[PDB]
Amino acid sequence: KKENDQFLEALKLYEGKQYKKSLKLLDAILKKGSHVDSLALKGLDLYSVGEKDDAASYVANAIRKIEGASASPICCHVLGIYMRNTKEYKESIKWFTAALNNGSTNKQIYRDLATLQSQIGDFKNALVSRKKYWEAFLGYRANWTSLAVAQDVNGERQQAINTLSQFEKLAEGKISDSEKYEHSECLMYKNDIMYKAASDNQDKLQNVLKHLNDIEPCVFDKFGLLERKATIYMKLGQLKDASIVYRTLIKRNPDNFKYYKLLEVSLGIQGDNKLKKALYGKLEQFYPRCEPPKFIPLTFLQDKEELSKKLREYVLPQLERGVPATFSNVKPLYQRRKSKVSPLLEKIVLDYLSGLDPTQDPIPFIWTNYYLSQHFLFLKDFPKAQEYIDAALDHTPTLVEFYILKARILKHLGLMDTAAGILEEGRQLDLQDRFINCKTVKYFLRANNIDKAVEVASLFTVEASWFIVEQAEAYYRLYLDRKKKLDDLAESDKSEQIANDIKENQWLVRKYKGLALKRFNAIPKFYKQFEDDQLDFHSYCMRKGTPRAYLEMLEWGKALYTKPMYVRAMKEASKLYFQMHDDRLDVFGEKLIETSTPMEDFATEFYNNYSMQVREDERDYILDFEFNYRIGKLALCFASLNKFAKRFGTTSGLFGSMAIVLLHANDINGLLFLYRYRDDVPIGSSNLKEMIISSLSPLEPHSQNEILQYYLY
Amino acid sequence: PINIRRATINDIICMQNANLHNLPENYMMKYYMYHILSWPEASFVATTTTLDCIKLDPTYLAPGEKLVGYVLVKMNDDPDQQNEPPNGHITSLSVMRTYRRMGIAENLMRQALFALREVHQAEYVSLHVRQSNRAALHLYRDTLAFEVLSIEKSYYQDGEDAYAMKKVLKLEELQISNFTHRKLEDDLESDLLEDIIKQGVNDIIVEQKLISE
Numbered sequence: 006k007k008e009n010d011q012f013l014e015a016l017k018l019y020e021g022k023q024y025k026k027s028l029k030l031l032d033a034i035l036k037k038g039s040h041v042d043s044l045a046l047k048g049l050d051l052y053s054v055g056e057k058d059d060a061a062s063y064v065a066n067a068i069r070k071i072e073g074a075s076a077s078p079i080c081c082h083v084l085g086i087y088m089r090n091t092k093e094y095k096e097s098i099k100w101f102t103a104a105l106n107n108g109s110t111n112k113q114i115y116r117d118l119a120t121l122q123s124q125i126g127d128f129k130n131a132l133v134s135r136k137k138y139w140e141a142f143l144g145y146r147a148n149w150t151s152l153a154v155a156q157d158v159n160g161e162r163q164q165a166i167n168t169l170s171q172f173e174k175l176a177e178g179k180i181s182d183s184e185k186y187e188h189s190e191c192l193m194y195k196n197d198i199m200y201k202a203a204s205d206n207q208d209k210l211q212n213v214l215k216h217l218n219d220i221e222p223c224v225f226d227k228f229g230l231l232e233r234k235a236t237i238y239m240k241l242g243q244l245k246d247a248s249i250v251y252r253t254l255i256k257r258n259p260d261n262f263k264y265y266k267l268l269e270v271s272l273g274i275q276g277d278n279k280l281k282k283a284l285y286g287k288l289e290q291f292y293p294r295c296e297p298p299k300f301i302p303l304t305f306l307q308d309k310e311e312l313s314k315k316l317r318e319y320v321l322p323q324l325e326r327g328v329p330a331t332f333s334n335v336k337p338l339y340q341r342r343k344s345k346v347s348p349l350l351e352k353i354v355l356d357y358l359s360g361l362d363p364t365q366d367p368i369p370f371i372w373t374n375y376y377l378s379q380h381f382l383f384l385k386d387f388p389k390a391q392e393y394i395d396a397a398l399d400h401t402p403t404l405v406e407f408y409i410l411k412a413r414i415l416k417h418l419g420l421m422d423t424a425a426g427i428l429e430e431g432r433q434l435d436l437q438d439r440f441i442n443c444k445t446v447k448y449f450l451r452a453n454n455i456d457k458a459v460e461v462a463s464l465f466t467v468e469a470s471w472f473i474v475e476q477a478e479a480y481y482r483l484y485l486d487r488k489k490k491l492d493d494l495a496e497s498d499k500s501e502q503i504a505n506d507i508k509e510n511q512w513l514v515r516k517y518k519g520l521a522l523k524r525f526n527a528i529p530k531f532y533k534q535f536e537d538d539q540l541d542f543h544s545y546c547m548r549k550g551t552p553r554a555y556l557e558m559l560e561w562g563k564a565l566y567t568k569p570m571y572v573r574a575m576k577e578a579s580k581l582y583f584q585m586h587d588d589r590l591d592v593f594g595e596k597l598i599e600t601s602t603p604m605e606d607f608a609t610e611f612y613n614n615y616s617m618q619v620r621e622d623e624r625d626y627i628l629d630f631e632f633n634y635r636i637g638k639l640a641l642c643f644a645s646l647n648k649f650a651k652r653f654g655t656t657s658g659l660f661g662s663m664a665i666v667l668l669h670a671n672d673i674n675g676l677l678f679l680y681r682y683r684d685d686v687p688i689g690s691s692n693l694k695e696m697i698i699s700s701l702s703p704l705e706p707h708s709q710n711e712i713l714q715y716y717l718y
Numbered sequence: 719p720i721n722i723r724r725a726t727i728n729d730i731i732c733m734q735n736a737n738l739h740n741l742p743e744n745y746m747m748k749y750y751m752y753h754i755l756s757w758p759e760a761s762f763v764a765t766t767t768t769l770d771c772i773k774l775d776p777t778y779l780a781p782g783e784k785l786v787g788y789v790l791v792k793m794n795d796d797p798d799q800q801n802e803p804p805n806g807h808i809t810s811l812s813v814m815r816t817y818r819r820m821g822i823a824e825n826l827m828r829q830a831l832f833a834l835r836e837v838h839q840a841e842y843v844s845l846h847v848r849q850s851n852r853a854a855l856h857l858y859r860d861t862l863a864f865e866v867l868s869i870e871k872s873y874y875q876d877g878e879d880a881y882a883m884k885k886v887l888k889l890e891e892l893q894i895s896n897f898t899h900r901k902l903e904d905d906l907e908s909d910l911l912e913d914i915i916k917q918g919v920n921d922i923i924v925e926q927k928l929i930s931e
């Protein structure tokens with residue numbers, strides 16, 4: 006029994022975060038070796054102190070010596086903790102429940118379980134754990150909130166509403182000032198659940214409304230409540246009522262476009278240009294400094310003279326104040342109403358420039374030239390884009406914006422090193438501007454100048470995910486370039502030259518290819534950690550009293566692998582895996598470049614998780630097609646082809662091109678898809694390439710070049 | 719144009735990628751989550767927006783919708799100050815310099831301050847500004863009417879003087895509609911389209927562009 010005492014002191018010590026002192030006692034019990042839970046605790050101790058390799062050995066040991074599956078409650082608990090630290094959440098759940106199954110009396114295990122179960126998406130079992138914890142501790146509000154949330158997440162909306170109603174009763178008199186916020190949030194959260202449940206039912210919606218009216222005095226989220234109130238009125242067909250609320254929202258934030266468009270709908274004028282013109286003239290008086298009353302009409306006016314005047318009134322005052330974003334502010338009009346707005350703004354701004362003296366009106370002068378440069382760049386008139394930016398730079402060469410734009414021009418011309426160099430002049434203006442430092446880093450990576458990019462970024466001497474993905478793409482381009490130099494490199498005195506060179510470029514090719522795969526693979530690791538970042542919040546949001554924000558976080562978690570950076574890494578990385586699959590017939594990532602399962606490697610690291618979360622109306626079907634095509638699942642290839650047509654029609658060149666590749670088993674992209682499947686489908690191949698080049702004529706230099714090098718290698 | 723709205727967790731990846739930080743990426747992400755999930759009504763963002771009429775950049779929330787500024791806000795939750803009056807803290811006010819001269823920093827701050835008073839009954843907000851930049855000084859002291867209490871010497875990590883500033887929060891003063899003119903306002907009751915059908919000759923004249931053929 007002397008051992009159990011030592012062990013228990015150790016246990017206490019571990020709990021007091023005194024790991025080294027705890028280990029001493031264990032090393033002693035073990036020096037005397039059969040001890041299962043002194044093995045486990047030592048495992049946990051080694052982990053707590055950095056000895057991760059040894060920790061695993063001791064844990065694995067303890068678990069082998071547990072054939073009976075019946076270990077002690079304390080041993081089970083210790084393993085539960087260890088598994089949670091190493092992020093074996095399913096394993097942690099088994100051990101924590103084993104602890105209870107073997108007679109543990111620690112009710113806190115249920116709280117630990119609820120967190121883990123929520124984290125792995127097992128909300129049915131998480132709900133069970135919340136019920137078990139709640140009944141042990143009916144006096145803590147956080148347990149009622151978590152129970153209600155767990156209920157709502159399982160679809161038991163009425164139950165969740167009933168749970169929240171119950172606590173309201175308990176608290177009816179005992180809401181301290183310290184508790185008013187949580188109370189406010191729980192009231193709004195209950196309204197949310199009632200609102201969803203009500204669907205389009207008029208009587209139900211009418212009850213959601215009265216509830217909302219009753220809680221208002223106790224709800225501090227006035228924005229949330231007014232938005233809910235307006236939406237209810239809309240669904241009730243009480244439009245005048247909704248319009249009052251929207252006007253109330255606009256008054257609270259006249260800089261939010263969304264409320265103005267909803268106001269139009271609630272007045273029934275969304276299609277009435279004259280009445281909208283009246284509405285915005287009226288709102289403009291209330292909110293003369295705000296964008297929406299001034300900008301929304303630019304969006305619908307059809308009379309040329311009228312549109313021209315309102316455009317002038319919007320743009321000219323910004324040029325006068327020297328606003329760098331003037332063009333950015335109207336760009337959506339150039340995008341959506343090009344033929345209409347573009348020639349009007351061209352005249353307005355050229356005429357304005359005409360009346361400016363560079364010496365007496367220098368600010369309007371340079372910023373007007375800046376606007377015009379963007380104007381002409383957007384319309385693809387490069388000489389004019391250059392001339393206007395040059396006029397601005399010649400006048401005032403100390404404004405970094407002028408370099409950013411000059412760089413963008415050259416980037417569109419496809420001169421990537423030059424573009425980077427120009428930005429780097431802008432950077433020298435203010436070496437403390439982090440934002441310019443970052444754009445410069447990016448531009449050098451786009452030029453494949455990794456050394457210079459790393460050097461520039463090292464001024465603030467940690468890897469950012471955006472940097473890592475840009476670096477991956479650079480390595481991939483460098484890979485393609487080295488391979489091309491190797492293929493083009495394929496008497497006896499200089500047959501010593503080509504011999505060593507081949508050997509050099511064979512090395513670099515492997516280096517770069519491996520480095521590209523390693524960099525891409527780091528992106529899913531970032532996103533998996535973002536997913537894991539939810540762990541603390543299952544409990545914390547309940548304690549803090551922010552159930553609505555918690556539910557928004559769960560929706561964010563379920564969309565992580567559909568996010569832009571993750572999807573970008575997945576699509577680029579697929580180029581490599583698909584290739585390795587076809588052609589098939591760790592500081593530098595060589596182990597990744599020599600895999601026997603490129604397709605299982607892709608699916609496991611990237612594609613599966615994206616596939617589980619993506620909405621059907623956002624799916625890349627071409628990717629699915631190409632992926633399943635190499636998986637031998639041609640059934641899914643048909644599904645993909647069909648579901649593709651059912652969204653873009655069958656006129657698409659890519660649509661035609663795809664169908665053929667399956668059957669066998671002008672429009673630029675279509676011709677290209679065929680090309681990368683020329684070894685499986687019998688094409689002209691050489692007459693296809695000449696086709697692809699004739700199509701390149703119109704596009705800007707950058708697009709021409711990128712295709713010629715990295716798409717038609 | 720630029721839109722101003724409440725921050726949501728859907729904004730945080732873009733906030734993270736909008737600037738280089740000294741802390742590690744996962745630390746920042748957890749930090750952003752801590753803010754937005756603790757004070758989900760206090761923080762605001764400024765974004766571009768497109769309206770109804772391929773190297774995906776990390777600061778786009780949606781096509782045509784780019785994050786260009788935000789204000790990240792919290793209430794006091796230091797255990798060592800559990801008996802002090804509720805006060806607000808501006809953790810971060812960050813606006814792309816290229817989007818300057820559009821009032822963005824002021825609009826974000828004004829929404830932040832009002833939300834602090836209305837949602838959290840915060841009594842004051844306290845903050846410091848580098849003695850270096852007058853733009854920040856002008857923003858807080860002049861535009862936003864913060865009191866300059868004192869100058870804390872060698873306050874910053876690199877040894878720069880700081881201005882100590884404080885603003886007492888009063889809901890009636892923070893009301894956004896107080897700052898729409900440099901003064902008609904919506905009475906939230908009258909008909910907005912009332913003008914269109916008035917029959918007075920001067921009405922017919924000024925309201926010319928509203929009469930169609």
Ligand SMILES: Nc1nc2c(ncn2[C@@H]2O[C@H](COP(=O)(O)OP(=O)(O)O)[C@@H](OP(=O)(O)OP(=O)(O)O)[C@H]2O)c(=O)[nH]1
Nearest residue numbers: 413416417444447569772773774775776777778780781782
């Ligand atoms: N995720 C996402 N990103 C988008 C979207 N639209 C544009 N972008 C990106 O934002 C940056 C700005 O693009 P543009 O305004 O078209 O200007 P630019 O290409 O001529 O520079 C570009 O990345 P960049 O090459 O890094 O631009 P830059 O730094 O060279 O200016 C562009 O790819 C979108 O809907 N979603």
